[PDB]
């Protein structure tokens, strides 16, 4: 048998990331397969969230939310126009028809 | 020397992911360190994008964008109120002061 010849066939400990992000260990201590499985999920997730995020961020900033106030204002305007009509039509009724103004007990 | 023995000390090929997502190979063919490095980025990215996505999605849907239409309508209303004032004030000028209406050439 080889003179001792310890079976130290450890794979390349190329893990040189002397960094300790809370999940770094767990990330290295996980099996590459799993990390990959979560990549297909997390990656596709971020990918899908990129499509949305792109739009979302562009839309949101370009979004507000006031159409109901608008509507109330349009309804209000149609309401004021109601009075405008009532008042102008009367003003006109005094103005348009000369020498005609409703013969009220003016004199 | 050992009777051939062969150095077949290959690590456990526990890569049972018999799946071929376009990046699966490349994902396994990358070094775990790198996959981890991109996790710290992609993960924190998705983390940040989760915070925003959450709000964004909640906000966007609950957002619109009409305040300027609103404003135009408020300006419009103030405008109509301008007339309402002009017309009501005149209607009143005919109504309020009895036996007083501007002695126009009515008679």
């Amino acid at each position: 048998g080889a003179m001792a010849g310890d079976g130290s066939e450890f794979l390349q400990r190329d893990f040189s990331e002397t960094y300790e992000r809370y999940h770094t260990e767990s990330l290295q201590n996980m099996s590459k397969q799993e990390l990959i499985k979560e990549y297909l999920e997390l990656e596709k997730c971020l990918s899908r969230m990129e499509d949305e995020n792109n739009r979302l961020r562009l839309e949101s900033k370009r979004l507000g939310g006031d159409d109901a106030r608008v509507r109330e204002l349009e309804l209000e305007l149609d309401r004021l126009r109601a009075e405008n009509l009532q008042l102008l039509t009367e003003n006109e009724l005094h103005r348009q028809q000369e020498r005609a103004p409703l013969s009220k007990f003016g004199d």
Side-chain angles (χ1 to χ4, degrees), chain A:
Chain A
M3 41 134 104
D6 176 74
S8 352
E9 345 88 337
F10 51 81
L11 69 313
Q12 313 92 278
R13 4 91 355 140
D14 194 61
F15 287 85
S16 316
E17 272 275 288
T18 328
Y19 281 100
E20 283 179 296
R21 300 85 154 200
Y22 312 120
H23 214 46
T24 337
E25 277 291 322
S26 326
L27 284 170
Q28 1 275 284
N29 295 301
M30 284 235 299
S31 346
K32 217 221 200 126
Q33 276 202 134
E34 314 310 278
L35 295 152
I36 297 162
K37 308 232 212 74
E38 41 218 285
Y39 267 129
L40 330 182
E41 307 231 40
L42 208 90
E43 192 258 24
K44 275 289 129 280
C45 277
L46 186 44
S47 316
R48 289 214 44 181
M49 307 253 291
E50 279 222 51
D51 272 282
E52 276 181 46
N53 281 218
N54 275 2
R55 284 270 234 86
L56 273 174
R57 300 250 319 206
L58 298 161
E59 292 181 40
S60 45
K61 59 186 218 344
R62 248 276 16 173
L63 276 163
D66 332 82
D67 78 86
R69 180 93 135 69
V70 173
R71 206 151 299 103
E72 296 210 64
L73 298 167
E74 303 242 278
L75 298 158
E76 203 112 80
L77 281 164
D78 269 88
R79 211 268 107 56
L80 275 188
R81 288 174 161 263
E83 263 75 77
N84 278 259
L85 150 59
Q86 284 157 93
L87 311 154
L88 270 119
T89 216
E90 268 204 305
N91 207 289
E92 271 199 88
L93 278 156
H94 195 77
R95 288 199 279 106
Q96 291 173 114
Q97 44 285 92
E98 249 284 50
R99 317 275 303 156
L102 271 180
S103 332
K104 303 285 198 61
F105 259 72
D107 44 304

